[PDB]
Write a protein that binds this ligand. Sequence first.
Ligand SMILES: [Mg+2]
Length: 137
Amino acid sequence: ISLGPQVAEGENVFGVCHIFASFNDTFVHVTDLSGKETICRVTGGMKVKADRDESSPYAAMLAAQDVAQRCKELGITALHIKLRATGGNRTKTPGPGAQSALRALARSGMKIGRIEDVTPIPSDSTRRKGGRRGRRL
RNA sequence: CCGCGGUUCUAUUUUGUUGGUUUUCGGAACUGAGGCCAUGAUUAAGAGGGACGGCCGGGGGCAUUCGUAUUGCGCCGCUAGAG
Ligand SMILES: [Mg+2]
């Protein structure tokens, strides 16, 4: 009770932290083991007011700090990790904010379980956007 | 190839007293059974065709099945951002 479980000191409570780090944003999202219920979702957009640093490591660590204090306030100790890129037909590698957010989560008084990749990997995707001649910059 | 059976006509004769001439008279017409031919087919192209045996291949057509992804929808969660 009191915004927390009745777990003993010897046992730790396990959550699931989806880190959807794409380009131009970074989502850190803590849920239960099934993922049905969500505790807190913080993203770099609500921590930098520049519209350019949404995927910045400076904003990513701040977002991870907020979900860390919220998890500790809710009495959550151990936390699995599910790293996710944009996926689909689009880019399959995680954005810049993934490493800073993960480092912040470890150092801000949290425990780490298993790390897994939940990137959407198609067997063979649809027509990816851009044209056959690519994005001419 | 060689001989033997097997057909139709015809240059000439002088069986010079005319007549009839036998003129099979000479040869050329169609044919059946034989004998002999060492009897008669060059080989099978590092040419080809086809057959035969076990394979082999994202080769083709039809049918069937599977995969996550994308999009949308319907529920539940939490937040003011998302892109
Ligand atoms: Mg250029």
